[PDB]
Nucleic acid binder design. Structure first.
Ligand code: MN
Ligand code: ZN
Length: 207
RNA sequence: GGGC
RNA sequence: GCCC
């Protein structure tokens, strides 16, 4: 509101922990980014650097719940109850912490661009691989086969009617990279963010 | 064609 | 279904 003036969603302590964690990102390595949800109301964010296997992956509660339940049916299949424990402030904090003039690669750059610009990061350069749906998802099964344990949010049925595999920001990054590289490596990935930064963890008794 |  |  007009009388509310809060600069950050995170405490300085957590902002400093975030800054340190993001030193694991190489400012010059190929970096994929993808989101689920609208750029004005994102619910899942992923960045991925195949060179190290490092990824950033986190969630956000939707503001437009009617649009969300609709988007879930046709794209992401994310159960909204599973988004309760998420850290507010993380989307802005992570985007603000990205290196100046970083080059980010994506599939369909329009939504990624709107998100970054809404966060004042017009300095970030975007490379759109601009593949067909078919070509971009050649390694879709192979990626889910290998990395399913990295995201459990996508349990809703998604339709195109015909049922299709749900869209995950993290699996998307991995499979798009596989498509461009012409193959998928078998390698163990590494989460950049601490678990307690991404979700509300931690009571012995109610009240 | 894309994106959710 | 909605968005470019
Ligand atoms: Mn996308
Ligand atoms: Zn996911």
């Amino acid at each position: 509101g007009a009388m509310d003036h809060v600069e950050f969603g995170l405490t300085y302590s957590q902002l400093m922990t975030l800054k340190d964690a993001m030193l694991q990102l190489d400012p010059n390595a190929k970096t994929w980014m993808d989101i689920e949800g609208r750029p004005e109301d994102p619910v899942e964010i992923a960045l991925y650097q195949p060179s190290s296997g490092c990824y950033i992956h986190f969630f956000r509660e939707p503001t437009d719940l009617k649009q969300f339940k609709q988007d879930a049916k046709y794209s992401h299949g994310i159960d909204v109850t599973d988004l309760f424990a998420t850290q507010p402030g993380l989307t802005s904090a992570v985007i603000d912490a990205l290196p100046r003039n970083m080059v980010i690669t994506c599939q369909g750059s329009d939504d990624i661009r709107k998100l970054l610009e809404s966060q004042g990061r017009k300095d970030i350069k975007l490379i759109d691989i601009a593949l067909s749906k078919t070509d971009s998802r050649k390694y879709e099964n192979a990626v889910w086969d290998q990395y399913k344990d990295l995201c459990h949010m996508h349990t809703g049925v998604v339709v195109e009617k015909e049922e299709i595999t749900p869209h995950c920001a993290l699996m998307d990054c991995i499979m798009f990279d596989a498509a461009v590289s012409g193959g998928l490596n078998t390698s163990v990935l590494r989460a950049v963010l601490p678990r307690d930064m991404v979700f509300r963890t931690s009571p012995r008794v109610v009240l």
